[PDB]
Symmetry: C3
Subunit: 333 residues, 3 copies
């Protein structure tokens, strides 16, 4: 395979490594490295801990971006400091269980997989060792996404280019943290030690936490997402195990690929869209008003009570034509 090679420096979510939308480049071999890290993390503002397993140290794993017809060459590394075997499966790839059947590595090993990016869209990647370990590694955090762009960039299905000013990757994670008799969340010394209680809970299908970027409140405060009035923002949303229903509170999905695949035209003007468990989708919005927005799953219990809220802070001029407070709160006459 005699094509040019290009290295990518991955960046942690919700940011996305620099890339072209439309490109004059032809196919390349695009090189990525992912290093697995098992670690105990804090997932809420109460201090609840969680035995996480991650690609590159983050939940979600970083977004990889390539173009149709590129070859994606990933070096997957499982350092000896980890305890379990791992692998990687790309929903964008064809054959061998998405790559999982060619990438099983013990602690202390690495492997190099290449796949051709023949399908456009956003796609999940995740670990999938085998059997009951599959769901457990996924819901422990071992999932991310890849975006395969058309070489002409995105379009609206009517001949017009859609160009985003910025892209964010929101990875949503369903987490299953057991409770003790008195009702407090349990802590564990290792992923192995967490397994029996965690599996019992998993099979009841109700998460204790549903978070963006790994933690309640991760995408708030200093880490709110940002935009300006006038900017077109692409929001890639993934969920490797469980459905979600994204919604931008105060905005819309101007152009939405809820099934996430760019061979299909986007839908327009949505209020709420739907990410099937095991998939990524994408929505574009051009901001029209300044201020705070919340980006949620619109099961509001999950959003407000289980963790699944991000914020945007948007700068610019208020548009009184679009919305105005005609009369401020006052006593009823």
């Amino acid at each position: 395979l005699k094509l040019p090679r290009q290295k990518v420096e991955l960046v942690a979510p919700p940011f996305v490594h620099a890339h072209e939308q439309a490109t004059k480049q032809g196919p390349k071999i695009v090189e990525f490295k992912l290093t697995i890290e098992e670690k105990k993390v804090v997932i809420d503002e109460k201090g609840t801990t969680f035995q996480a397993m991650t690609f590159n140290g983050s939940m979600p794993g970083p977004l990889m971006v390539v173009h149709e017809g590129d070859y994606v060459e990933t070096t997957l590394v499982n350092p000896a400091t980890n305890t379990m075997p791992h692998n990687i499966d790309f929903h964008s790839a064809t054959g061998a269980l998405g790559g999982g059947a060619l990438t099983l590595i013990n602690p202390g090993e690495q492997v190099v997989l290449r796949w051709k990016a023949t399908k456009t869209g956003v796609f999940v990647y995740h670990c999938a060792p085998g059997g009951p370990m599959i769901p457990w590694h996924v819901v422990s955090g071992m999932n991310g996404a890849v975006m395969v762009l058309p070489r002409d960039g995105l379009n609206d299905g009517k001949g017009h280019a859609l160009k985003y000013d910025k892209v964010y990757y929101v990875g949503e994670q369903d987490m299953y943290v057991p409770r003790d008799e008195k009702g407090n969340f349990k802590s564990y010394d290792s992923p192995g030690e967490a397994f029996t209680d965690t599996e019992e809970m998993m099979k009841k299908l109700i998460p204790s936490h549903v978070v963006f970027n790994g933690k309640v409140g991760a995408l708030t405060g200093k880490n709110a997402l940002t935009a300006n009035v006038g900017e077109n923002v692409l929001i890639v949303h993934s969920q490797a195990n469980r459905d979600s229903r994204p919604h931008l509170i105060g905005g819309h999905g101007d152009y939405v690929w809820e099934t996430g695949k760019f061979g299909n035209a986007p839908e327009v003007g949505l209020e709420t869209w739907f990410i099937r468990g095991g998939s990524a989708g994408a929505a574009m919005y051009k901001f029209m008003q300044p201020g705070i927005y919340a980006y949620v799953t619109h099961n509001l219990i999950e959003a407000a009570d289980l963790g699944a809220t991000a914020h945007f802070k948007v700068e610019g001029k208020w548009n009184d034509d679009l919305m105005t407070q005609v009369k401020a709160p006052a006593e009823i006459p």
Copy 2:
């Protein structure tokens, strides 16, 4: 803003205030009033009670109907007879959390919000005070919908008008009523008193009841929906918090906007469609056969056992070409 003003007299669901589909009117300021009512109601045929919170006294709140480019001016009233602050957020509107950030009112206050109807479709509106109160006010009943019609009326995406003879609004409500030790549903003296037990249940994500129009059996008997053979009926369906899968038993969705937005063409000939939690959708059907139909969510446990069944009673002539009982029940030969 120097446009003509038009008042609307809202009507209780499942009915919809009179309106034009295609119109020669230009943009107007369309005036609506919503008066919040907290009240204890009965939600099933066993006499289970529920601490409801409502717009205009109903679950769902009434359907508001306007046209693209209208300005919607709502007077939201929170009488002093209520106990909590409330607001309103319109998924159809742009900015300020859908209006919620401009409409927070204490008991004894009112506020007037105006928003421009720049997106066509059916959309949820709901209360969203802040934080954990958001899901609680929604699942207590504080949600409804608005329909923003194209000025040329609805179309099939192929150049042909779709005109409905009648429209119904089915609002679906997931309710969380705790049980006591012996397993009976609990009753509470106030919404505040219901809150701790109700929140604990909410976060487990399983409703005790799933109802249309506020109560088991609301849209049955004297209050069945009606049609005649030959009539094209639009059914708007909303669910502000939780997914639903509508189905007309014995019929179809001839033209369905499951994501609910008229900038997208309808899908045709569906058996079951999908309303994402946090959205409204719409389906049109031209009745071909007389008799009873059930309109359900097609999780049949929720439909038959938790409350989510409506009926249509349809008049007209039976069509033996479409369906016939060739041989009535008889002993096996």
Copy 3:
């Protein structure tokens, strides 16, 4: 009704009786017989038993295949060896609750229903006796599907024929098996005896098992699905009560009708699709790589832990352009 009659010999899922895609035949009366069987079956590899109720002895019931404008004439038989009344409702049919209101039969009776196939697609059929019996009979196994093909066969929405080399029918069943105090699954002597415990569990909305073709591992081993590289395979997927999110691990949905209705163009290049509870959908894929694939619902807990995994074994030549292991597992340098 003076049309030619054609008998079909139904076959057990996941196979599908022989049929034409595009046809030069005009409308016919196509004759099917379904014989209800209540029986206790084993549903997992641990030996858990289940009080099943079936059409033709299988879960799902067999796939019926006809063309648009055919008349489907079904003889439904409820032998005296059964204990309960049953009926049949076709989501493909118009009127009388899909046929249910014309087909209620006691043990020892049969009935003959005819309906005109005016809507194209794949559709659920199921028993629906009335009231709380509706969900119980469905989740006990009394559901299958029918496929109504265009007379010109399937198309891609752009003027091109899609022709499948083979079709499989995957029926997914949510099952509710109660547990005793110590946590073992219960066994029952009759469906009637299982009813009280089973209904209590049903209304909590969480299945104990989610299976394809009636049992954990049914579509594995000797009974794996098969294909060759180059073959275009149609996979019809139904779920009469509960949502599913199909995914072909290592493949894609090349052409997908997730709402299942052929009057709509397929979506292309999907990773995961969505079957609404109460519906059937269909996906086509042309295999490009040999080896084992898993076909799952991509709630991986349900797939790996509750039963919902099938396999394909695919013959042919590996394509190193599409995917290759560049470097086998090795020690990290």
